[PDB]
């Protein structure tokens, strides 16, 4: 518990990476026409958060 923090027509996109023990998150939100596959076109992802965790990561799970 040595660190803690608090703050279909559409698609939410994200990127997660860990470097130097800093864990970094980026995002984009957009409307979409079709659900079957990712959109055949370009849009950029922008940063949200930088976390000083130092912890090691090799697996993950999504929460429904």
């Amino acid at each position: 518990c040595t660190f803690e923090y608090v703050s279909f027509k559409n698609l939410r996109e994200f990127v997660f990476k860990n470097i130097d023990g800093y864990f970094k998150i980026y995002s984009k939100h957009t409307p979409i026409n079709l659900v079957r596959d990712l959109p055949q076109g370009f849009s950029a992802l922008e940063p949200l958060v930088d976390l000083p965790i130092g912890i090691n990561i090799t697996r993950f799970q999504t929460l429904l």
Binding site: D20, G21, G54, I55, N56
Partner: peptide
Amino acid sequence: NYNYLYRKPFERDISTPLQSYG
């Protein structure tokens, strides 16, 4: 005292066998 225990860049662990400074 003997409480000050010891065994990547900014990598850390607390799982177990540790030494400690006399």
